[PDB]
Amino acid sequence: APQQINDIVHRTITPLIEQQKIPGMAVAVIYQGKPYYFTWGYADIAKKQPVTQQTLFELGSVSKTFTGVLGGDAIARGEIKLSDPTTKYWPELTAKQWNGITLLHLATYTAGGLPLQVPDEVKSSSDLLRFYQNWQPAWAPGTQRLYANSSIGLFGALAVKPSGLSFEQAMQTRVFQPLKLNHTWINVPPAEEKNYAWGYREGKAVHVSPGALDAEAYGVKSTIEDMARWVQSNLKPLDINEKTLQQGIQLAQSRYWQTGDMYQGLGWEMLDWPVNPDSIINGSDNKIALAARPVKAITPPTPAVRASWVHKTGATGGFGSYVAFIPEKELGIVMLANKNYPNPARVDAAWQILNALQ
């Protein structure tokens, strides 16, 4: 890499790793459209396996960006509309609280207080139906945002129904394969297990457990190379040859709702660039990111704004990830770590790196 990229990355990430006691980390910077890679530490502490450019990390909620894009692609295919009632795709959802809840509300966490977590006891198709039928909204649709796996996770499951494909097969054939994300997985195959980092929680090696709507809300594992390619694809959707996918990427960066200085896309969240770093740094803290906040509808939604800080944090019990990019500057960053460390530390580091290069 150019020495400037080398220096800001190393000067930022070395201290981060030390302060946060991160066992292993991979970083990619995309600069004028080219990726530069950096790795530190261990994918598996016990077996002494280093982090490499091929190491798989659990993306946790950064998976929602793939879900939002796959949804976008289904809209572009004319398979679904965000204006469609949820019941169009799940007629068994007959409980009256569902009247007026659209796919848009599910995708953007505005259905009226769907919970952050699907309960552990929910597994089967019938368990899930029961859960949603019994759920009582605290608020009318399209009035408040509450970040929720049970919301965007349901969106992802319903979005692929017309296609006839399983969520995983839809994701592979419509997103992963076309973008050449050949080491990105919802289920890690046996052949790739040698590259699957362990996550670390309280010093213990852990992998994400199966759960309802896991694939849709937090299912994806990927390498730093594939995630850099994911960033490039979202930076320049027009370079993508598959028409509906190019369009789907654009739809996922549209601005649907505003709370404070942030706008809600499909999976992605966006702020105007230049961003106030305290606005995104403090904003990333779960204290704000996970809170109930009233939203203003953007009517109609603003198409992807190039002058944006577009980002998503993600975590599982053992991993912490962050992706941010600025389309107008052809600039972006991916940070993958096998410890779930605080969001504001992630955003602070990313801002320090991108600000310096911008």
Ligand SMILES: *[B]([O])([O])[C]([C]C1=[C]C(C([O])=O)=[C][C]=[C]1)[N]S(=O)(=O)[C]C1=[C][C]=[C][C]=[C]1
């Ligand atoms: B995501 O990374 O924004 C999301 C947030 C979340 C946290 C928790 C929690 O604290 O238990 C529960 C649900 C959602 N994370 S996640 O979609 O990858 C789900 C998950 C969290 C922790 C461990 C495994 C899975």
